[PDB]
Design an enzyme around this catalytic site. Structure first.
Site, PDB file in Angstrom:
ATOM      1  N   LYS B  76      13.397  -0.963   9.190  1.00 34.69           N
ATOM      2  CA  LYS B  76      13.498  -2.177  10.048  1.00 34.69           C
ATOM      3  C   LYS B  76      12.749  -3.337   9.391  1.00 34.69           C
ATOM      4  O   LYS B  76      13.145  -4.461   9.583  1.00 34.69           O
ATOM      5  CB  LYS B  76      12.934  -1.915  11.461  1.00 34.69           C
ATOM      6  CG  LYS B  76      13.765  -0.976  12.340  1.00 34.69           C
ATOM      7  CD  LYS B  76      13.404  -1.036  13.847  1.00 34.69           C
ATOM      8  CE  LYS B  76      11.978  -0.593  14.151  1.00 34.69           C
ATOM      9  NZ  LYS B  76      11.719  -0.455  15.620  1.00 34.69           N
ATOM     10  N   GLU B 128      14.151  -4.758   0.215  1.00 32.08           N
ATOM     11  CA  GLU B 128      13.063  -3.979   0.846  1.00 32.08           C
ATOM     12  C   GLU B 128      11.876  -4.916   1.143  1.00 32.08           C
ATOM     13  O   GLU B 128      11.704  -5.879   0.449  1.00 32.08           O
ATOM     14  CB  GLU B 128      12.659  -2.820  -0.077  1.00 32.08           C
ATOM     15  CG  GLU B 128      11.524  -1.926   0.423  1.00 32.08           C
ATOM     16  CD  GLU B 128      11.872  -1.111   1.660  1.00 32.08           C
ATOM     17  OE1 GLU B 128      11.920   0.129   1.577  1.00 32.08           O
ATOM     18  OE2 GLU B 128      12.082  -1.717   2.715  1.00 32.08           O
ATOM     19  N   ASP B 129      11.111  -4.630   2.182  1.00 34.89           N
ATOM     20  CA  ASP B 129       9.972  -5.482   2.585  1.00 34.89           C
ATOM     21  C   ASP B 129       8.814  -5.309   1.584  1.00 34.89           C
ATOM     22  O   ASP B 129       8.270  -6.308   1.150  1.00 34.89           O
ATOM     23  CB  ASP B 129       9.525  -5.195   4.027  1.00 34.89           C
ATOM     24  CG  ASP B 129       9.166  -3.756   4.345  1.00 34.89           C
ATOM     25  OD1 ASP B 129       9.468  -2.916   3.530  1.00 34.89           O
ATOM     26  OD2 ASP B 129       8.593  -3.495   5.419  1.00 34.89           O
ATOM     27  N   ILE B 130       8.447  -4.078   1.252  1.00 41.05           N
ATOM     28  CA  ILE B 130       7.248  -3.833   0.403  1.00 41.05           C
ATOM     29  C   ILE B 130       7.389  -2.599  -0.474  1.00 41.05           C
ATOM     30  O   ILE B 130       8.041  -1.673  -0.034  1.00 41.05           O
ATOM     31  CB  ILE B 130       5.962  -3.727   1.269  1.00 41.05           C
ATOM     32  CG1 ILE B 130       4.687  -3.720   0.407  1.00 41.05           C
ATOM     33  CG2 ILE B 130       6.007  -2.532   2.227  1.00 41.05           C
ATOM     34  CD1 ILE B 130       3.404  -4.094   1.178  1.00 41.05           C
ATOM     35  N   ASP B 132       4.726  -0.084  -2.268  1.00 42.54           N
ATOM     36  CA  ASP B 132       3.283   0.267  -2.234  1.00 42.54           C
ATOM     37  C   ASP B 132       3.128   1.508  -3.131  1.00 42.54           C
ATOM     38  O   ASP B 132       2.884   1.326  -4.311  1.00 42.54           O
ATOM     39  CB  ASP B 132       2.883   0.360  -0.753  1.00 42.54           C
ATOM     40  CG  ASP B 132       1.435   0.689  -0.426  1.00 42.54           C
ATOM     41  OD1 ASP B 132       0.753   1.242  -1.280  1.00 42.54           O
ATOM     42  OD2 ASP B 132       1.012   0.401   0.713  1.00 42.54           O
ATOM     43  N   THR B 136       9.339   5.581  -1.195  1.00 40.67           N
ATOM     44  CA  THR B 136      10.546   5.275  -0.383  1.00 40.67           C
ATOM     45  C   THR B 136      11.646   4.774  -1.330  1.00 40.67           C
ATOM     46  O   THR B 136      12.768   5.234  -1.211  1.00 40.67           O
ATOM     47  CB  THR B 136      10.280   4.280   0.755  1.00 40.67           C
ATOM     48  OG1 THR B 136       9.789   3.140   0.059  1.00 40.67           O
ATOM     49  CG2 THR B 136       9.323   4.791   1.816  1.00 40.67           C
ATOM     50  N   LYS B 161       2.608  -4.399  -3.535  1.00 34.64           N
ATOM     51  CA  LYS B 161       1.184  -3.978  -3.453  1.00 34.64           C
ATOM     52  C   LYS B 161       0.993  -3.160  -4.735  1.00 34.64           C
ATOM     53  O   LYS B 161       1.194  -1.963  -4.703  1.00 34.64           O
ATOM     54  CB  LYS B 161       0.843  -3.202  -2.176  1.00 34.64           C
ATOM     55  CG  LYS B 161      -0.649  -2.971  -1.942  1.00 34.64           C
ATOM     56  CD  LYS B 161      -0.948  -2.064  -0.733  1.00 34.64           C
ATOM     57  CE  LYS B 161      -0.288  -2.528   0.561  1.00 34.64           C
ATOM     58  NZ  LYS B 161      -0.732  -1.703   1.730  1.00 34.64           N
TER      59      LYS B 161
HETATM   60  O1  LIG Z   1       0.896  -2.615   4.133  1.00 32.00           O
HETATM   61  C1  LIG Z   1       1.725  -2.310   4.808  1.00 32.00           C
HETATM   62  N1  LIG Z   1       1.829  -2.919   6.064  1.00 32.00           N
HETATM   63  C2  LIG Z   1       2.907  -2.520   6.908  1.00 32.00           C
HETATM   64  N2  LIG Z   1       3.825  -1.503   6.423  1.00 32.00           N
HETATM   65  C3  LIG Z   1       3.676  -0.894   5.094  1.00 32.00           C
HETATM   66  C4  LIG Z   1       4.369   0.063   4.377  1.00 32.00           C
HETATM   67  C5  LIG Z   1       5.620   0.771   4.872  1.00 32.00           C
HETATM   68  N3  LIG Z   1       6.718   0.150   4.118  1.00 32.00           N
HETATM   69  C6  LIG Z   1       7.732   1.035   3.512  1.00 32.00           C
HETATM   70  C7  LIG Z   1       9.138   0.388   3.521  1.00 32.00           C
HETATM   71  O2  LIG Z   1       9.332  -0.160   4.815  1.00 32.00           O
HETATM   72  C8  LIG Z   1       7.279   1.362   2.069  1.00 32.00           C
HETATM   73  C9  LIG Z   1       6.328   2.552   1.987  1.00 32.00           C
HETATM   74  P1  LIG Z   1       5.942   3.026   0.238  1.00 32.00           P
HETATM   75  O3  LIG Z   1       6.423   2.062  -0.744  1.00 32.00           O
HETATM   76  O4  LIG Z   1       4.491   3.308   0.273  1.00 32.00           O
HETATM   77  O5  LIG Z   1       6.631   4.247  -0.148  1.00 32.00           O
HETATM   78  C10 LIG Z   1       3.711   0.198   3.157  1.00 32.00           C
HETATM   79  N4  LIG Z   1       2.683  -0.614   3.140  1.00 32.00           N
HETATM   80  C11 LIG Z   1       2.656  -1.269   4.284  1.00 32.00           C
END
Ligand SMILES: O=c1[nH]cnc2c(CN[C@@H](CO)CCP(=O)(O)O)c[nH]c12
Ligand SMILES: O=c1[nH]cnc2c(CN[C@@H](CO)CCP(=O)(O)O)c[nH]c12
Lengths: 212, 215
Positions: B76, B128-130, B132, B136, B161
């Site tokens: 989402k 994708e939003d982020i 990290d 994913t 990140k």
């Molecule tokens: O910092 C954050 N604040 C709010 N939400 C998140 C998330 C979850 N985001 C997903 C994709 O929706 C990626 C997970 P990853 O790439 O770790 O696999 C990672 N960091 C944060």
């Protein structure tokens, strides 16, 4: 101000961009955004005074808050851009809310929210034309979630296309009795990215027959 | 924008208090300028490319409204970012279409499948939003490649990140770089709260378990 004209080919031009697929302009981005923000104030003013089941502090009833937010169900794929804009305006007006999505075509994707019983729920939808899609969604959400109240906010209302009774509680814009495109409205997923809403030239709904 | 702290030490942006925020990461103006810039990069990269012609039952044809760029937005968190990005891509005249997928962790599992069924030989861009840990997107990239057999598969992220990586993942397009902290705002949330914020902030460490009840 938006500069709206026609080129030598008779094609509508808005801010220097041509829309050869369009018959007429319905609404500029400036009109759309002002209309959405106005409805956002109506929604925030209506819900902020209300109370519903308390799932944060063990019960019973408590005011809409960040702890017990308004539940918003957005209908994918058509409402995603309208929802993105609406929620930011709702935040501006200080309405505590959370958004989840259902996808319809048949139900293709279910909500993941599982605690809506006794909650105020608002459905964000792109358009009400025949009224059949909202009648389908409203019956399902009531029967499966048992919300305290269920209301509908639509970006657009085409009042002349109704086949069943459906009167949304909140309406941002009234559209002509024509096929609209732009600001989420599509022809096989094309034209959703437009910042303005237009009517489609007749017969252009068959422009892209290939399944994506 | 005006960013300050009030007498209680709370971050205030444009007269609005954010008691859950440790630091401001980016104002709406910086985020929007950053997204439009990546939109121009995406438009400049894809505009001149060609791929499978599904419109004219042909072999290969330029990216067009007949054979558009395929965009897959990850729900989402990416819906607000995607809504803005598509409108910038339209400003730059990139023909494109958008479908949605949703993944969750328990190890990764698909929650919602894409409905597009002719992606073979097509250019595909993941929104994708982020990024990290990278877990994913390694899952999504492996699944889309195997099941759809795209001509090319690239990724655009609102946020990187860099300090969180546990698997190799560098998105092809990155709008913003964030600190190694939990971010909130503009799609980022704590139990679905804070997504509506127009700015991105870091979260105070004690605020992450504020809303424990399942929605
Ligand atoms: O910092 C954050 N604040 C709010 N939400 C998140 C998330 C979850 N985001 C997903 C994709 O929706 C990626 C997970 P990853 O790439 O770790 O696999 C990672 N960091 C944060
Ligand atoms: O004018 C239009 N342009 C582009 N699309 C549409 C639609 C389809 N929209 C779905 C809901 O997402 C069904 C609504 P309903 O059952 O009430 O008819 C109706 N009118 C238009």
């Amino acid at each position: 101000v938006h500069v709206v004209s026609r080129n030598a080919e008779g094609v509508i031009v808005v801010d220097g961009k041509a829309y050869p697929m369009a018959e007429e302009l319905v609404a500029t981005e400036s009109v759309i955004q002002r209309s959405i923000k106005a409805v956002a104030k109506q929604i925030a003013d209506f819900y902020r005074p209300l109370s519903h089941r308390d799932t944060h502090g063990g019960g019973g009833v408590a005011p809409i808050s960040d702890e017990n937010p308004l539940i918003i169900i957005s209908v994918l794929k058509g409402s995603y851009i309208f929802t993105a804009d609406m929620v930011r305006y709702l935040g501006d007006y200080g309405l505590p809310h959370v958004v989840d999505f259902l996808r319809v075509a048949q139900l293709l994707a279910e909500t993941q929210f599982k605690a809506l019983r006794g909650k105020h729920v608002l459905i964000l939808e792109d358009i009400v034309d025949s009224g059949k899609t909202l009648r389908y969604i409203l019956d399902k959400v009531q029967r499966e979630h048992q919300p305290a109240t269920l209301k509908v906010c639509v970006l657009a209302d085409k009042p002349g296309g109704r086949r069943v009774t459906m009167q949304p509680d909140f309406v941002c814009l009234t559209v002509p009795n024509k096929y609209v495109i732009g600001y989420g409205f599509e022809v096989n997923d094309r034209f959703r990215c437009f910042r303005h809403i237009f009517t489609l030239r007749p017969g252009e709904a068959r422009r892209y027959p290939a399944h994506l």
